[PDB]
Amino acid sequence: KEMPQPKTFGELKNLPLLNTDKPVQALMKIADELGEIFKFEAPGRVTRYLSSQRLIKEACDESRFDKNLSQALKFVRDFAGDGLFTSWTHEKNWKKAHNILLPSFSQQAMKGYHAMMVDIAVQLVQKWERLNADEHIEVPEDMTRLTLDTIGLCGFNYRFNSFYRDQPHPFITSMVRALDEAMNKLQRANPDDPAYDENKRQFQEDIKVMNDLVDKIIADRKASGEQSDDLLTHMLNGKDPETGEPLDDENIRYQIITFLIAGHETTSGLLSFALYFLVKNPHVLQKAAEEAARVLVDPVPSYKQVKQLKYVGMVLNEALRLWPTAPAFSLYAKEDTVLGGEYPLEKGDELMVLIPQLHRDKTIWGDDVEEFRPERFENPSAIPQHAFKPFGNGQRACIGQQFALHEATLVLGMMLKHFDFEDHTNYELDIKETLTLKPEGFVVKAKSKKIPL
Amino acid sequence: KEMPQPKTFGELKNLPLLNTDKPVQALMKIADELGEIFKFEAPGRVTRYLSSQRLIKEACDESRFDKNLSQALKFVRDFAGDGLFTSWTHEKNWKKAHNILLPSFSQQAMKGYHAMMVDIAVQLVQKWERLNADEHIEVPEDMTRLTLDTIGLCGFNYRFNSFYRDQPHPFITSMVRALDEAMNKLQRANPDDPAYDENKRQFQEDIKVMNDLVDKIIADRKASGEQSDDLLTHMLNGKDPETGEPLDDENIRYQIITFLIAGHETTSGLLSFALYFLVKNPHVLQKAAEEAARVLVDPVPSYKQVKQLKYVGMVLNEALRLWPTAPAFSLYAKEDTVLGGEYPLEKGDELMVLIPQLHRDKTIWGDDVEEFRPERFENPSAIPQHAFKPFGNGQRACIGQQFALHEATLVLGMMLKHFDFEDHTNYELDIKETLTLKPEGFVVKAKSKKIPL
Numbered sequence A, B: 001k002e003m004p005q006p007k008t009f010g011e012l013k014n015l016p017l018l019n020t021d022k023p024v025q026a027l028m029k030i031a032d033e034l035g036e037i038f039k040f041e042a043p044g045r046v047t048r049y050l051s052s053q054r055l056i057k058e059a060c061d062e063s064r065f066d067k068n069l070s071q072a073l074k075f076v077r078d079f080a081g082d083g084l085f086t087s088w089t090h091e092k093n094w095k096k097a098h099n100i101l102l103p104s105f106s107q108q109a110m111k112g113y114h115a116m117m118v119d120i121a122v123q124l125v126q127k128w129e130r131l132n133a134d135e136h137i138e139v140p141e142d143m144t145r146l147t148l149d150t151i152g153l154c155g156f157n158y159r160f161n162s163f164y165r166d167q168p169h170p171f172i173t174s175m176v177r178a179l180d181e182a183m184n185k186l187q188r189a190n191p192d193d194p195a196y197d198e199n200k201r202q203f204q205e206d207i208k209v210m211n212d213l214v215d216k217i218i219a220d221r222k223a224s225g226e227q228s229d230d231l232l233t234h235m236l237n238g239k240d241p242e243t244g245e246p247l248d249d250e251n252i253r254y255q256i257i258t259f260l261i262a263g264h265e266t267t268s269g270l271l272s273f274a275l276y277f278l279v280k281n282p283h284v285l286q287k288a289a290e291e292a293a294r295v296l297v298d299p300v301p302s303y304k305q306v307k308q309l310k311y312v313g314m315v316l317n318e319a320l321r322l323w324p325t326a327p328a329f330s331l332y333a334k335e336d337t338v339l340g341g342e343y344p345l346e347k348g349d350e351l352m353v354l355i356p357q358l359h360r361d362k363t364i365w366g367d368d369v370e371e372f373r374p375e376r377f378e379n380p381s382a383i384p385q386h387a388f389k390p391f392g393n394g395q396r397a398c399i400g401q402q403f404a405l406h407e408a409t410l411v412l413g414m415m416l417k418h419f420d421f422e423d424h425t426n427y428e429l430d431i432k433e434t435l436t437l438k439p440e441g442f443v444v445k446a447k448s449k450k451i452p453l
């Protein structure tokens, strides 16, 4: 009868368990103890966390369950609007933007963005080439610089020039602070306290900063009418085949903001986690390094060459298995239904999918789920369906998957080609949680292989 | 009848006239009022400012006058030590370092440094090409980024990576704070007041950061034995022909600090003033731009191409005429002597050479001394002796003259090739005075001429 449920705090029920700066990791620890499913109650709200493939494969049935906006995404909606990430499936603007943008994010479309991805990738490599002997690299910080600039340059032909700065571009500063505020509202439960009136003031300033800049460029592009290899161009000229309508300027701005929120820290995390696992597993590093040296024979990597980096792609997937940088997504029941032949759900009942736990399901991956072994993904078809979901599910899955994977593969490939890396501090893994996961304080020393660009 | 003298302040005499943020420009104004020569008195001290080619040509007689350490240089000597810039001619270490370093600072040694100058120059160019529309350039700031990195790289193969920073390297931060601190001591009631105790504490720390870093790199280079083509290698391997001795590690340190102090601000100042004059004189800019396009026909400029940039060289000299960025130097009488057949001097009596005034001597340059005409230097031979002294005089002249002019010519040549410049704010000239002069707040917009590298 009784579904498992963690410890309670009187009238607040389970809510104070999320009063911590590592909620996802705390939920993973509760999942290990309680198993494939547990209930999580707060005042006037309930959800259910899923950890097993057998339940999550049902949850991924699109006729039965549809994407839900978690409380986090709802707060991100205040600045991300009805962009793809924070819109409901049934909103007109989701499907409309989805139909228009899908060709712009396809595997074949990556040939278009490639040149500009290399531009930023080269800047990364050149920064590291120009370091002095005893200097070190702050990994996630530089990965974040690279991903922001790559999406900025590929998305709307704008250069944040993050590698020319210590304090980031105003937009970026406002965005991270807005994200932090959004995530902090999950912990508290006193909206209109006089102290938090300061937080709401900054929030509205940050919203305006992001809106003003993006709206400025949208207008500048329409007035000049120039063509480029970016998403903004496709969003201005694009028509939805279904409704026959283009996106209006307001939605276009929300998509641009969305691409930065959704993509930048997820991708930077992937590279950060990938490099971490590589330096903690030297034999795996040699393999990836060998492939990089063999395949990337030109100083400027080509699109075709990135596709050949098979083992580098396996490394990234295994990093995503262990630490999926967007660790959860939310679903709701479209109608009354039974989950697993023993858990009745009413219409509107919300489900959370703990992706890190899904990826540690003993019944799928084996006994050694904590080990870093890219060999697991030697054959893509071997992996059973709905067992590996770092990019979410179905029509609400990540539209920027091919973008993210092409960027991470290109950059990691170039990193392993040009440098030997050293875990000089014997770094202990400390996972910082915002909307996404990152290895905080992860540092390495890169020794150059003296290969020209 | 006696020597002209500006207004006095009772017991303090002329001293309060230097109590201003712009002392050299005030002295220039005094020189216009009083003319060729004036006495300047203070409690227990006296000097004489020379402004005409007639008197200064006698002052440049090394048999009668030698370099004096002005009070400014004495304060710089606390961290510049017995380096070339702050050592007396009669100190053993001056002549040793002079003989040892001259070969490394020749016009023909610049062939070796050229590649490294281009490295930093290319970073500048790429920064500006990566600026977005309606972004501007802070001119002296970017020129200082270039000159520091260039001398760091060419001097001891160390990369400050200034174009990757908003907040400068710990060294440069400490060095500028030390220079600023040292320059403020010229105007101070009495330095032993409790209010300056933090400044004195900070001053000692600034010295330690510079010493520790430089000593370490010398030691790293000493142990490694790596043969770079920089000034450090020549100081570790060089022996003075006269004595037969090398420089000891302590002096080598001071020399490296000296090249960073004496070189970085004067050279960036020059580039800042040159670009200022070009944007304020568009016909002259077009002439320079046309020469840059005609001569620099390769993506990477060669040493020999930089030598052909004749008009750009004339632009730099004319900028040095109007605003020599090291605007004064001090001399003392070697024996009792008569100056100009009018003013008798005693042994040890000091003189100051006001170079901006010398360069405005109407008897040498004509009536239009305030106007920017590079064509004055069309025929260098026509200029009388000791009329143009932006690089000091005699054996105590600038050892880095060829370095500075090669850099400035290369960088400005590339600037004029790759960009059209706009004086978008209609900048009003404001000359900030430290050890050197620079156009504070000088800003421009660079539109790329779209020529690749």
Ligand code: HEM
Pocket: A067, A084, A085, A098, A151, A258, A259, A262, A263, A264, A266, A267, A270, A324, A325, A326, A328, A329, A330, A390, A391, A392, A393, A395, A396, A397, A398, A399, A400, A401, A403, A404
């Ligand atoms: C390692 C990199 C990335 C990971 C792990 C990741 C993960 C995800 C996940 C799990 C979702 C589903 C969220 C949910 O169900 O609520 C999602 C959605 C999305 N992602 Fe990503 N993502 C990555 C990179 C990117 C990039 C680079 C972009 C864009 C340039 C992007 C754009 C989106 C968009 C637009 C959606 C919303 C899809 C829709 O509902 O139409 N993502 N992503």
Ligand code: HEM
Pocket: B067, B084, B085, B098, B151, B258, B259, B262, B263, B264, B266, B267, B270, B324, B325, B326, B328, B329, B330, B390, B391, B392, B393, B395, B396, B397, B398, B399, B400, B401, B403, B404
């Ligand atoms: C626009 C650029 C420059 C100007 C206007 C300039 C000006 C001068 C002047 C006027 C002096 C004589 C100082 C005095 O008599 O008190 C001098 C000395 C010196 N300069 Fe420069 N300088 C420049 C660039 C450089 C550079 C790039 C370096 C080194 C890389 C350098 C190193 C020195 C040194 C070592 C001395 C001392 C010479 C000695 O006494 O043996 N200078 N400079």
Ligand SMILES: O=C(O)[C@H](Cc1c[nH]c2ccccc12)NC(=O)C(F)(F)C(F)(F)C(F)(F)C(F)(F)C(F)(F)F
Pocket: A018, A023, A024, A040, A041, A042, A045, A046, A047, A070, A071, A072, A073, A186, A326, A327, A328, A329, A330, A352, A434, A435, A436
């Ligand atoms: O925002 C939510 O709805 C749920 C849990 C939750 C937050 N507040 C609640 C109140 C009652 C019941 C559940 C909740 N949030 C999370 O699970 C989380 F821990 F914040 C999360 F995991 F970090 C996350 F928000 F889901 C997420 F991973 F950041 C997100 F990206 F939003 F999926």
Ligand SMILES: O=C(O)[C@H](Cc1c[nH]c2ccccc12)NC(=O)C(F)(F)C(F)(F)C(F)(F)C(F)(F)C(F)(F)F
Pocket: B018, B023, B024, B040, B041, B042, B045, B046, B047, B070, B071, B072, B073, B186, B326, B327, B328, B329, B330, B352, B434, B435, B436
């Ligand atoms: O340091 C000196 O001796 C003289 C004048 C001076 C400074 N303190 C004094 C006290 C009494 C009499 C004269 C002075 N200093 C200057 O003329 C100066 F302008 F302040 C100066 F800034 F130091 C300068 F000399 F012009 C100079 F440009 F900085 C320098 F580089 F030193 F030449």
